[PDB]
Structure formats: structure tokens, C-alpha cells
Amino acid sequence: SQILDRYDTIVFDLGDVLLHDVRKMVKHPVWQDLEKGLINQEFALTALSCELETPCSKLKEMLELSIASLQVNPLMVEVLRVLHKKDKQIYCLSNVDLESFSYLYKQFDFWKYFDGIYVSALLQLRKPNPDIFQYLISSASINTKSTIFIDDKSENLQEAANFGISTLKYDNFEYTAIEGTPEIHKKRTLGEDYLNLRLRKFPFCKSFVSNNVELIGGEDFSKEIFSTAVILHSYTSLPDDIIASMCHEILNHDGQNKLRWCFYKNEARPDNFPDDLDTTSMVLSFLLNHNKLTIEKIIPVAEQMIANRNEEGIIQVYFDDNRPRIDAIVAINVLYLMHQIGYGERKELKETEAFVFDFLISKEYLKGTRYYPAPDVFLFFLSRLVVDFPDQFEKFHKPLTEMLITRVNCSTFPLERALRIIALKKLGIVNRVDFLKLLDTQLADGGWPVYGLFIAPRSNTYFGSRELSTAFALEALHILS
Amino acid sequence: PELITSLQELSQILDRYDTIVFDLGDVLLHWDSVHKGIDDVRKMVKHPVWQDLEKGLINQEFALTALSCELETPCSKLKEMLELSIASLQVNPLMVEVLRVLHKKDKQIYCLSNVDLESFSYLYKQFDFWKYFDGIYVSALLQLRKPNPDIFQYLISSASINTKSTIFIDDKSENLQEAANFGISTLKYNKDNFEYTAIETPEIHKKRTLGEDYLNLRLRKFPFCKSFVSNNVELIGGEDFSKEIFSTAVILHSYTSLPDDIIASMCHEILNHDGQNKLRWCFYKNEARPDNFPDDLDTTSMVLSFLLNHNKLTIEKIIPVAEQMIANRNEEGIIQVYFDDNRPRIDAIVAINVLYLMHQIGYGERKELKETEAFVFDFLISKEYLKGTRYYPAPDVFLFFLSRLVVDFPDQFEKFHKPLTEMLITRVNCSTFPLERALRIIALKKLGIVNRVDFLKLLDTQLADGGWPVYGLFIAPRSNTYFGSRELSTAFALEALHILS
Ligand SMILES: CC[N+](CC)(CC)Cc1ccccc1
Ligand SMILES: CC[N+](CC)(CC)Cc1ccccc1
Ligand SMILES: [Mg+2]
Ligand SMILES: [Mg+2]
Numbered sequence A: 001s002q003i004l005d006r007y008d009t010i011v012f013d014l015g016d017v018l019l020h021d022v023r024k025m026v027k028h029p030v031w032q033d034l035e036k037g038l039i040n041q042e043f044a045l046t047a048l049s050c051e052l053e054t055p056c057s058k059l060k061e062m063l064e065l066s067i068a069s070l071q072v073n074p075l076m077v078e079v080l081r082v083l084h085k086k087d088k089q090i091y092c093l094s095n096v097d098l099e100s101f102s103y104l105y106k107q108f109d110f111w112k113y114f115d116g117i118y119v120s121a122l123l124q125l126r127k128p129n130p131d132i133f134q135y136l137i138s139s140a141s142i143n144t145k146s147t148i149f150i151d152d153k154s155e156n157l158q159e160a161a162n163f164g165i166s167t168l169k170y171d172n173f174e175y176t177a178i179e180g181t182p183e184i185h186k187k188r189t190l191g192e193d194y195l196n197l198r199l200r201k202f203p204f205c206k207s208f209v210s211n212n213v214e215l216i217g218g219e220d221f222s223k224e225i226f227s228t229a230v231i232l233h234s235y236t237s238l239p240d241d242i243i244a245s246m247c248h249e250i251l252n253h254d255g256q257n258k259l260r261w262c263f264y265k266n267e268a269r270p271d272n273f274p275d276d277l278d279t280t281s282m283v284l285s286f287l288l289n290h291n292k293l294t295i296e297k298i299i300p301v302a303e304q305m306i307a308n309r310n311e312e313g314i315i316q317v318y319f320d321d322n323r324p325r326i327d328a329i330v331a332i333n334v335l336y337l338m339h340q341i342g343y344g345e346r347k348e349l350k351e352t353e354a355f356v357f358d359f360l361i362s363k364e365y366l367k368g369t370r371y372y373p374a375p376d377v378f379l380f381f382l383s384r385l386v387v388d389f390p391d392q393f394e395k396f397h398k399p400l401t402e403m404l405i406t407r408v409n410c411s412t413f414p415l416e417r418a419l420r421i422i423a424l425k426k427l428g429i430v431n432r433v434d435f436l437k438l439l440d441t442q443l444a445d446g447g448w449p450v451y452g453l454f455i456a457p458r459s460n461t462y463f464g465s466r467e468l469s470t471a472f473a474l475e476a477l478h479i480l481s
Numbered sequence B: 001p002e003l004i005t006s007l008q009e010l011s012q013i014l015d016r017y018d019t020i021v022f023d024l025g026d027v028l029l030h031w032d033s034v035h036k037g038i039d040d041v042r043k044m045v046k047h048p049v050w051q052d053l054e055k056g057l058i059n060q061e062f063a064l065t066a067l068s069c070e071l072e073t074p075c076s077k078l079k080e081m082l083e084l085s086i087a088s089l090q091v092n093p094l095m096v097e098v099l100r101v102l103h104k105k106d107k108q109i110y111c112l113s114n115v116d117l118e119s120f121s122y123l124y125k126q127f128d129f130w131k132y133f134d135g136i137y138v139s140a141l142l143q144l145r146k147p148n149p150d151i152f153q154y155l156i157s158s159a160s161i162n163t164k165s166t167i168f169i170d171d172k173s174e175n176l177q178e179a180a181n182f183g184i185s186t187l188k189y190n191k192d193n194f195e196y197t198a199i200e201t202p203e204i205h206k207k208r209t210l211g212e213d214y215l216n217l218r219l220r221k222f223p224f225c226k227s228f229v230s231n232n233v234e235l236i237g238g239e240d241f242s243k244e245i246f247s248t249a250v251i252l253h254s255y256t257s258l259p260d261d262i263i264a265s266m267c268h269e270i271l272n273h274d275g276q277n278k279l280r281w282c283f284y285k286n287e288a289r290p291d292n293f294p295d296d297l298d299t300t301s302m303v304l305s306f307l308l309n310h311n312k313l314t315i316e317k318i319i320p321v322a323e324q325m326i327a328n329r330n331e332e333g334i335i336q337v338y339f340d341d342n343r344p345r346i347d348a349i350v351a352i353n354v355l356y357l358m359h360q361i362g363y364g365e366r367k368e369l370k371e372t373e374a375f376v377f378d379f380l381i382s383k384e385y386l387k388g389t390r391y392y393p394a395p396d397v398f399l400f401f402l403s404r405l406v407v408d409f410p411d412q413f414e415k416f417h418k419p420l421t422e423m424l425i426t427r428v429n430c431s432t433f434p435l436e437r438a439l440r441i442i443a444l445k446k447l448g449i450v451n452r453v454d455f456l457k458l459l460d461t462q463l464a465d466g467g468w469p470v471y472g473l474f475i476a477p478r479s480n481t482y483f484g485s486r487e488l489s490t491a492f493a494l495e496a497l498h499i500l501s
Helices: A029-035 A041-051 A056-068 A074-085 A098-107 A130-139 A154-162 A182-201 A226-234 A240-251 A277-289 A295-306 A328-341 A347-361 A375-388 A394-406 A414-426 A432-440 A466-479 B007-014 B041-046 B048-054 B060-070 B075-087 B093-104 B117-126 B149-158 B173-181 B202-221 B246-254 B260-271 B297-309 B315-326 B348-361 B367-381 B395-408 B414-426 B434-446 B452-459 B486-499
Strands: A009-012 A089-094 A116-119 A147-151 A166-169 A174-176 A208-210 A452-456 A461-464 B002-004 B019-022 B108-113 B135-138 B166-170 B185-189 B194-197 B228-230 B472-476 B481-484
Touching: A009 A074, A029 A041, A041 A056, A056 A098, A074 A089, A089 A130, A098 A394, A116 A130, A130 A154, A147 A154, A154 A166, A182 A240, A182 A432, A182 A466, A226 A240, A226 A277, A226 A452, A226 A466, A240 A277, A277 A295, A277 A328, A295 A328, A328 A347, A328 A375, A347 A375, A347 A394, A375 A394, A375 A414, A394 A414, A414 A432, A414 A466, A432 A466, B002 B007, B007 B093, B007 B185, B019 B093, B041 B048, B041 B075, B048 B060, B060 B075, B075 B117, B093 B108, B108 B149, B117 B414, B135 B149, B149 B173, B166 B173, B173 B185, B202 B260, B202 B452, B202 B486, B246 B260, B246 B297, B246 B472, B246 B481, B246 B486, B260 B297, B297 B315, B297 B348, B315 B348, B348 B367, B348 B395, B367 B395, B367 B414, B395 B414, B395 B434, B414 B434, B434 B452, B434 B486, B452 B486
Parallel strands: A009 A089, A009 A147, A089 A116, A147 A166, B019 B108, B019 B166, B108 B135, B166 B185
Antiparallel strands: A166 A174, A208 A461, A452 A461, B002 B194, B185 B194, B228 B481, B472 B481
């Protein structure tokens, strides 16, 4: 339309806009708890089974039938498409429970036109409520004077109009051109102050070791360089002085030969413990990003990595023929370096990429990897490769996003909440729920609790640190605020 | 300003007040702190993370693990130091005597202190001055911390304190300062004297209202309390049963604010229940009764106790049924579950509910009750109740019903009070099921302890229509069938809400 081209930003509703008696269910107050993400469908159907005096299975079939009867609106989708081509900022703002949102994301394919998807079950907010409009506007930094909102309901358009956003009621299209927390900041400030103090005191990132993921009763072991590299890659808002001190510890790490890095400091290296491609890939990828190394110096190390494939063609974990292992996340971090340096189209990487893609798509990642038992870690690292090399990894985006959507608010560990927040936001989905619960678990000194990010399987030793946890939580807070 | 050195003069000033608030740390209890890394527990307790533990936001393992990094001290040394500190704890003989004297003067006496749940659990078992308090307000049970004014606002509101007649005793001036802002007079406890200064939410009610409207409408429409059955405790996808009378009787005993019109309607269901004969009741309606399934003492006890309470039946009519129950003992003397020699069963909650009716009708001194009462007592004390009972798998159900009996007949069950309180404290916030939170809140408050943690978490699981989720309260053990309803869950939750406001 000639109307929408006057606006920089268009916000789309889903229902009866892009998609076209179960009404007694969706009007019930319990359904609003479901829409808000407060409960899941199983518990919501149990309750509604009682209030609606209907066998639970009948409500499930009525709902299943109702979702599958949804059909795209071809006029609106094409409209969405033309706006996308015009480089508009486009957002989706809609009430829908989480599982329905999973089905609809899998089932349709217009999602790609959106710069950002704001769904009620991921926000714990519902669409007539002005709070959801205010959340959208500040989080997306929307200039309401150049923003128009498309909905079928007048309550929604009236609310948006009160924030100064024009409206298009979707037969007829009614157009009206409209012309007219500090707790987060405190928690961010506390956390930044905590992280900056820890890392200024100990730029070689500390770690602790134990036999459990919470590292209860863990002992101090601060003689591996990997955590330092993880933080440098993962928390993108370190002050320059800290970046420098941590870079210094990497460049001067003594578990180092010919740009092959070892996990351990020399003093702590088990006799005969080999260099590994995870530590090597991660530090090399950081040094190249910060212009401490050239592709010329890295490429021979990358060939050794290609030389390290097993009989199935998969690049292995260690520079040691007598210690053959594989790991989907080590595969990912190798592939990241490969695409960074120009190796992205080497045929010898095909089975390593196939392995990673299959690990995603088979849901085998729900079992964790050899060194990373928590499934969201695989998803997070995959999202880094997929979003940073999007043309090369196009076919990963939708399946990765599907998996992440189902895992929103599925675990209580703060670091796991952080990874889901960061990964979903990089994929254009706003996960406010995990964000809210992440804030609640900050400790009083500003740091989050220790978490066992990775594992030495031979000794079932978990490694982790408050620095790692806090670094991820701060990235999550910054990326959504 | 008024410096006091005379223990006599102290007693004379405290007597001028109706309410005395006592601190624990360095007032009633005293301890030492210096025992690779730090060598002073004072460095732990001062740390910000320790405030999270004190407020109940984390447990000891969690706080130590974090402190082991901040204080650069091996976690296991921090653990040893705490245990040594706690083991070193001594009672203050002067202040417990002052406390005891105030108690013997029928003063209203409260305890307000910062202590973490594990520590407070140990202290409660270890010492025995707690009986002198009318109410106990501990930071880990309140998720509030003592300097903060809102812990004072909470105490004053929870206990309906007249701050004009209230005096607070504490060793920390910051605590006294904050108390004086609320008009409470202060008494600083020093190593060498006393300093005496004479001094002159909306969400909760919305939730209460919504929950009351929910339950009143549900019980009006279905005064025979509905029930669902499934093989799992949250009854996900459970089927409608609604053919047992016991839920109706449990609601009448457990939620004490039903309007008279609902009470009348539910009482009619009990009296017109076809599964009864000569004032013995059967769990099931006839249409669902298994062939040869007997009447049982649990439904009977709870039904007769209610009908007596509401003057539907005389003591004269109950006492013969109660004598039959005494005739239902086994070779160990424990009263059994069913009116049926061919189906011998014992269950500790059924025993509790039979004992309740016994004491209520005048049978409380009958010697034939001894083995039943010792069964329930050993069941508590042996921690065997952590395994559930035959018909009630959730451990807090046994503690809840025990607390009804023990608080309602306190002269006969004195020896139960402290062990039961000890157990309940260890269970604060130990499970997520709303009904279980509600049982713990209700039971602890009857025992004088405010469990605000479970309360706040209970509030957050109310659904938008005012009802709580269904929960399987009791079990048909053979088929592993759970029974429950939203009415049951909401009734226990509303009672917990009322009892803590
Ligand atoms: C970077 C080290 N690693 C893989 C070698 C992380 C995935 C785990 C590990 C650490 C120490 C011993 C063994 C394995
Ligand atoms: C009062 C009913 N009863 C004991 C008879 C106590 C909860 C459980 C029960 C219900 C149904 C069948 C068997 C036992
Ligand atoms: Mg709509
Ligand atoms: Mg004190």
C-alpha cells in the first residue's frame, strides 16, 4: 500500500491478520495464564477440564483441531514481504501460548520477514495491556511517530494509538494517522561492578572443580586458559583495560606451541595431555578478531585440524592420534575458525558440518555433548556460528530457532537461562521470561552463582566460575536491555 | 539514654510494657568466631552473600560455595568453621531468666532475629527457651532481614502489635534505631549495661478475594465436593470421579471460613450420603462401592467430628460409634482403619483423626488409646513419616493433621509440640506443590512460627480464576489411584492465606 510506505516501522498482529466452540476455552481466565507463559498446556487443559466440565482429551482435540485449521492470509503475507524488501523495521506482536507458538513457527515461513518477534508467552505480558506496548517500544527503541500497527481488534489499536502509533484496522482497511526499570539498571550496575573487580584482580579467569554441575564443595583450580577465552568471546562489553589484561594472559599462556594451545597451564598439565582443538580454535578465533594474528599464521594450524578427521570424516577433539574423540561443540568452534579464515568451502569439512547439523536435528543434543552436558550450551554455540556466517549456514536457522523456542524457561540454572536469552535474541526472538528469572538469581554482591560449564569426562570433573556465570548473565541483560 | 546496670531495675522496666521483642544473636545466645584462608567466621557473616542465606534465598551449601570464592578460603574449611561456631553456642542464663519471668507474667513475647534456616533448625532442637515465645519471626522464614524497616512493619502487622506498649531488646543499635522509627521503645544489650530509651499488600487481598469467589461458587454448584482420579499426583488428565464423600468432610475441617449456606449444603450431602449405616460412613457412594468394601474409621471420624462441631449430632450418639473404634484394635493395640476384621490395616493419619474424635467427645483419657498414640508419636519421631502413610504419600499431610490434634488438645499432647515443630521447620520450602506449601504454613503458624517463604510461593501459583491446581491428597493404594480437586487445593491455600493475615 501507499500508506505503509510512509512509516519506518510496521508492527503486525498474527491472529486474523497473517493467519485466519473453542472460544469458551480461549476466553477463560486460565487460558490467559497460558497465553502469558505462566503455565503449560498440560496444566491449563487439566484446569479447564474442570471448569468447562469437558473431558481433558476433548479440549485437547478441540485445540489441536483449532490450531491445524489455521491458514495463511496470502494478501497480508505478500504485504509483509514487500515491506521487508523496502528495508522496513518489521515486528510481530501477538498473544499466543508457547506450544502453539512452536507449532506455528514450524508450520509457516513468513517469520523471516520480521526483525523481531514479541509473543505473549515469552514476555509474560498480554496484548491489550499497555505494559506490552511499552515493553515493545523501549526494547525495540521504536520511534512511535514513524510506526504503524496492524491489528483486527480495536482494543489493541486504541492502546497503541495512546502511545502515539498510527493504526490500520484489518474487506475494509481502516487507517488512522496518529500524531500524539531502575531495578534493571541497579542489577546491571552491581553485576558489572562485580565482574570488573573479579577480572581486574584475576585477568586469568579463575575456575573451580567438583563432581557436580553446581560445583558444591568445589576446590579452586585456576590453571586453565579456556575460561578466559570463553569470556572474551561471550561477554562483548568488557572495558578496554580488562580486554587487554585478558588478551595478555592468552598471548603469554605457556601451554602454547606453534599456535596450538593446551587447556592447562604447564604446571597443571597431566603427563602426556595433548593440545586440543577447542582451546586452540577459541583462542585463535579471538586473536584473529583482535588483530593479534593473521590468517597466514593461522591457516597451517587449520590444516592440522583438517588432518585430524576420523574414519567417518569428522574432525576430532585432540591433536593426538591415540586419543580419538568427537564433540559437537568442538566441531562448531572448529568450523567457526574455518569460515573466519577462508576455509569455509573446503570439502573436507562436509562431514563435520553434517555431524553438527544432525546432532541438532535428531534432538540428540538433548543428551548433551561429551564435554558439555547441558543442551542449551550446544544451542548457544551453534547460534554464534549460524548468526555470524548466515549465508553459509542458512539451513540451520529455522531448525535451531525451533529447538530454542521449545526450551524457553525449561531449566532454572542462571547460566542456562542466559544462553537461551542470548541465542534467541540473536535469532530475533525476545525471551523476557528467562530474563526476568535470571535477574532474580543474582546474589547480593552482584555475581551469579558458579556453574559447571564443561567437564573432563575421564575424571567426571566439572569446571566453572562465578566469572563465567556473571559474564553470560550480563550479556543476556545487555542484549535485552 | 537511660543507662541501666541493675538486673532488678531491668525487670521493673520490662514490666512496664505489654509486648517484649527479643533478639537471638548476642542476646539469648552467644558464640565464638575465631577457630589456609580466613580464620574468622565474622568475615562470612558480614559478607553480602550471607545476607542472601539469612533471607532464605539460598541454602548453606550454596552460600559456602560462593563464599569460598569471595573469601579465597576452601569451602570445607568454611564448613568446619560454621559447625565449630554453632557447636560453641551457649545460652545466656540472665536473659533466658528475664525471658522466662516475662512469660510467667503473661507478657506477649516475640522473637525477631536474623538466622539462616539450617542454623535455626539446629538451634530450635538444641535449646528449649522457644516455648516462652508467643511468636517466632526468623529472617530465613520471612525472606526479610532485620535492619530493613519492612521486617519491622511485617512483625507489627502480623502480630497486631501496639507499638506504644512494646519494647525491643537488641545488641545492635541499627536494629533499635529502625524499631524506634515505628514507635517501639528500645533496650540496647551491652557487655556491661543496658541502654533504655522510652519511645511514644493490595495483591494479597485481590488474591484472597478471587480465591474465595472461586471456592464459594465451586462448592455452591457442587456441594458434594468433586474429585478427579489419575495415577499421578498432579492428576494431569485425571478423570472425573466425584463419588466419594471424604473430600467434602476434609474441606469442612480444613478451611474454616465457609459461609453458613455452603456449610449447610455440604452438611446435607454428608447426612444424605447413602454410604452410611448407624452413623458409620463409607468412603464411596453406593454406586461406586466395591463389593464387600467396608466402612472406615477415617471417613467416620472426620464426619462425626464435623457433625458434632456443628450440633448436628449429640455426644450421646457419637460415643457408641467411638467405642466400636476402640473395639477395632489389633494385636499391638493400635486402632485399625476399617470396620472389618477381614481387612486389617493401620495408618497414622487415620490414627490421628480417630484420636481427634476421641479427645473431642470425652474419651481422651481412655487407656485403650495408649498404643495408638504411641504409634503416631513414634511415627513422627522415627522420621518414618518421611515415607508417607499407606493412604497419604505426602509427608506434610501427616505433620498437618498431627498439628490439628496437638494444637487443639494441647494439655494432652504437650510432648508432641516441640518434636513436631522441629520437623516442620526442616521442611520449610522443601517442595513446590501448592497444597503442600499450604499445609506447612498452616501447621507452623498453629505452632507459633511464621512461614512466609511457602506463603509467597503459594501466592504465585494461584490461577487467574482464583483456584489453585488440583493435587492428589490421598491414594487408593492398590490401584495407585490419586484423588483430588481444585476445591481441596484452594481450600487449603485460602486457609493458609487467612491464617497469615
Ligand atoms: C577445552 C577443554 N575441553 C575439551 C578438551 C573443553 C571442551 C574439556 C576438557 C578439559 C580438561 C580435560 C579434559 C577435557
Ligand atoms: C478415607 C479413605 N481412605 C481410607 C479408607 C483414607 C484417605 C483412603 C482410601 C480411599 C479409597 C479406597 C481405599 C482407601
Ligand atoms: Mg489478532
Ligand atoms: Mg543480635
